Amino acid sequence: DGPGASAVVVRVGIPDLQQTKCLRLDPTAPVWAAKQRVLCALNHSLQDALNYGLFQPPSRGRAGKFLDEERLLQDYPPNLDTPLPYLEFRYKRRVYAQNLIDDKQFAKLHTKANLKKFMDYVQLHSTDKVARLLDKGLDPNFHDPDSGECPLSLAAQLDNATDLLKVLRNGGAHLDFRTRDGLTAVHCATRQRNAGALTTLLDLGASPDYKDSRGLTPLYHSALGGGDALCCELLLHDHAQLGTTDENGWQEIHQACRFGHVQHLEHLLFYGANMGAQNASGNTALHICALYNQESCARVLLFRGANKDVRNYNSQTAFQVAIIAGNFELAEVIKTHKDSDVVPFR
């Protein structure tokens, strides 16, 4: 939780607080690691904090840009050096090439009534009208005040969203902009099982690994939601990371097994999920199957070599959990399974 040995002192200015903070940030670590350190130092003093990002201020004709979170922080040399490098922490608004818009005209684009009209255009799939307002300079990184959606996360829930998603991205929408509740458009496409929208977002360069306000990924959401498993496969095939946990140490396969999402479980195992992973109560995914009477999920885990002797922190095996829940058919499945009756992946 402390910075590594190669960390360097950086002054971070936060215009929306009118203050600066000096922090040790790690050039050998990812930019997203540096952002977490800034957030920790601000100790909940910002509204909508997950929509702020580290920004390299303009210095002598070179324009300012948001830092690529997935890149390594040393990919950004400090330039006309002051003893301390200087970064800023800015709300994720549209980055304009040039200043072509009067302050009065810019305000007119962004009244409450005109931002509602823009969201109504998205809802109604009026792609050309969206594009024309973007060309006039409308910033689409904002929240509808009633729903909390942003233009991109709403577009991600429409059928045949691809054309509209591309126009929003070309018009300055950040791919990782989060709704009021903390979801990116990648989460929203995944939750709706909108494979066309998800594919376009990933093809536009969105990361599959974005976290929501509880640390959960789109892949985690897909294991909670079940249904058609295509979106889960799309994420994994785009190298989504597995093993994300919630506050109780439940990973993706724990959730899939609670709800009987057997196709999600199988994709997660094929891509390397650890069958022995234990949550905060010490339960494996097999224990979860036994508790929720999820027999076909249990069969998949046993067939792939899950260890059925693991005890949870109540000293219970999955068999004993099944017996206590009254899940006698499932208990018999676990008890009679032979350890040789397996085809493991690795």
Side-chain angles (χ1 to χ4, degrees):
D1 189 85
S6 46
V8 170
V9 182
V10 176
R11 179 178 315 272
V12 178
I14 312 95
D16 290 350
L17 295 168
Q18 290 300 108
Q19 74 193 24
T20 72
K21 297 283 193 193
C22 284
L23 277 205
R24 277 182 59 107
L25 311 172
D26 203 333
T28 73
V31 167
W32 60 255
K35 175 194 52 186
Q36 284 175 218
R37 296 203 184 282
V38 178
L39 284 177
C40 191
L42 296 179
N43 205 332
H44 291 106
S45 55
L46 279 179
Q47 66 159 315
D48 196 25
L50 304 183
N51 279 328
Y52 284 73
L54 285 165
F55 187 90
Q56 181 158 240
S59 69
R60 251 103 211 273
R62 271 163 317 279
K65 59 184 169 189
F66 282 97
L67 274 65
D68 214 39
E69 293 203 344
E70 276 54 53
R71 293 222 288 184
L72 244 56
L73 186 71
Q74 64 194 4
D75 287 344
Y76 297 98
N79 207 21
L80 273 96
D81 280 337
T82 324
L84 259 47
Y86 180 66
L87 292 182
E88 285 191 347
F89 200 52
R90 292 197 196 171
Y91 202 72
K92 294 184 196 173
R93 301 198 177 92
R94 176 170 185 184
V95 175
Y96 293 91
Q98 323 161 28
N99 189 36
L100 273 41
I101 315 95
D102 194 349
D103 285 282
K104 284 180 188 166
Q105 286 153 353
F106 201 76
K108 297 169 197 184
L109 294 172
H110 294 104
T111 66
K112 186 187 171 84
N114 202 59
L115 295 183
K116 178 50 166 39
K117 173 64 72 168
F118 186 79
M119 286 302 279
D120 284 344
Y121 288 150
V122 175
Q123 177 68 69
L124 293 162
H125 215 136
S126 299
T127 300
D128 286 13
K129 303 190 167 288
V130 171
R132 285 175 176 270
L133 281 175
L134 293 169
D135 291 343
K136 291 174 172 168
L138 185 145
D139 184 350
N141 306 104
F142 71 89
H143 293 140
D144 183 88
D146 299 312
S147 70
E149 301 282 354
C150 66
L152 196 72
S153 69
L154 179 62
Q157 303 171 50
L158 304 175
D159 287 330
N160 306 323
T162 286
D163 71 321
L164 187 46
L165 290 170
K166 295 196 297 193
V167 153
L168 288 164
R169 175 59 166 162
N170 294 337
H174 297 284
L175 294 171
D176 67 339
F177 199 74
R178 286 163 174 92
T179 66
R180 186 169 66 212
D181 297 336
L183 301 188
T184 70
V186 186
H187 294 92
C188 298
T190 297
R191 287 164 59 80
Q192 301 282 177
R193 303 180 199 95
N194 189 339
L198 180 55
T199 294
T200 293
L201 285 165
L202 303 177
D203 289 350
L204 288 169
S207 165
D209 298 326
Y210 293 142
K211 309 307 187 290
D212 70 12
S213 72
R214 295 167 63 204
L216 309 178
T217 56
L219 180 74
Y220 203 101
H221 284 257
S222 89
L224 297 158
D228 194 317
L230 179 51
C231 283
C232 169
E233 167 63 25
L234 293 175
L235 291 161
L236 288 168
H237 182 95
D238 197 35
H239 318 289
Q241 289 172 348
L242 305 75
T244 300
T245 59
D246 74 359
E247 300 81 346
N248 291 313
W250 293 43
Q251 296 182 21
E252 300 92 353
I253 58 169
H254 291 101
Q255 299 291 356
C257 289
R258 171 180 185 170
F259 299 112
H261 298 150
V262 63
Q263 297 179 327
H264 288 78
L265 171 66
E266 293 218 65
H267 286 308
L268 292 162
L269 298 182
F270 180 74
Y271 277 85
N274 176 190
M275 292 182 297
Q278 280 172 287
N279 60 24
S281 303
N283 287 132
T284 67
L286 191 61
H287 284 98
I288 299 309
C289 299
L291 177 59
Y292 290 99
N293 198 208
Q294 291 297 176
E295 179 173 298
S296 66
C297 283
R299 286 184 199 281
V300 169
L301 285 168
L302 290 165
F303 184 68
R304 297 303 187 188
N307 188 324
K308 74 185 185 183
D309 298 332
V310 181
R311 306 197 168 259
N312 66 17
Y313 302 148
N314 291 334
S315 312
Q316 309 170 324
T317 65
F319 173 79
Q320 295 172 308
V321 168
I323 289 298
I324 287 166
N327 288 329
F328 303 110
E329 297 165 5
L330 202 159
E332 192 66 11
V333 170
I334 297 173
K335 170 195 181 184
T336 54
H337 182 263
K338 315 171 187 166
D339 296 333
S340 65
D341 211 338
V342 296
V343 176
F345 288 117
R346 296 138 176 108

